[PDB]
Amino acid sequence: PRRCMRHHYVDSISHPLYKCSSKMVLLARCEGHCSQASRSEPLVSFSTVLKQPFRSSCHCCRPQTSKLKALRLRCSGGMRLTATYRYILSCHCEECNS
Amino acid sequence: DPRRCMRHHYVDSISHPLYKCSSKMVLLARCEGHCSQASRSEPLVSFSTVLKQPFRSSCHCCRPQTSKLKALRLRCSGGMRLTATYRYILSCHCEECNS
Ligand SMILES: [Cl-]
């Protein structure tokens, strides 16, 4: 089966540079195999050599809708610091380059 | 031999989209298949104002790996000679959507 599904997991958010207390939060990701085949066929040009010579279709498992989240970290030096990220609510198969 | 990323041959009629021309039949190739790799998309974290692209993604697509540039002269009604170009695909493979 393993089609484009939404998946829950937990992770701990840290600042990549500063020293802060790890806060762990529930996240979601999209993952799976879109059923549609991907394809790529040549375009014909009477004007120029084509910068992009190919017409293609490719479906990828991506977030369809998501909710923005804020997160404050207790960072050393009495620093309060805030992080943003998007909690994924639904996933779908979507064209690689819309 | 499953339905994976590979080359397919077909003959196609080349014609100008605007001008009247004597069409030419040519052998073409395209890529088509199902890459084994699962696609995925995860949220990114940022301490700036919200990120414009909030997700890091992986997605493999069946694309031309190698190709040969072709040209073709079409005879057209106005006595005009029109030259088309296209790429003859030589090999296909699964490649990341972004690049
Ligand atoms: Cl010529």
Residue numbers in the entry:
A (entry chain B): 36 to 133
B (entry chain A): 35 to 133
From the paper:
Norrie Disease Protein (NDP) gene encodes Norrin, a secreted cystine-knot like growth factor, distinct from the lipid-modified Wnt. Unlike Wnts which have promiscuous interactions with Fz receptors, Norrin specifically binds to Fz4CRD, but not to the 14 other CRDs of Fz and secreted Frizzled-related protein (sFRP) family members. The Norrin mediated pathway maintains the blood-retina and blood-brain barriers and regulates angiogenesis in the cochlea and uterus as well as neuroprotective effects on retinal neurons.
We determined three crystal structures of Norrin, using selenomethionine-labeled protein for phasing. The Norrin protein fold is identical to that of the previously reported MBP-Norrin crystal structure. Each Norrin monomer comprises three β-hairpins (β1-β2, β3-β4 and β5-β6), a β7 strand at the C-terminus, and four intramolecular disulphide bonds. The two monomers assemble as an elongated, head-to-tail, dimer stabilized by three intermolecular disulphide bridges (Cys93-Cys95, Cys95-Cys93, and Cys131-Cys131), in agreement with small-angle X-ray scattering (SAXS) measurements which showed Norrin dimer in solution. On inspection the superpositions revealed a high degree of conformational plasticity in the β1-β2, β3-β4 and β5-β6 loops.
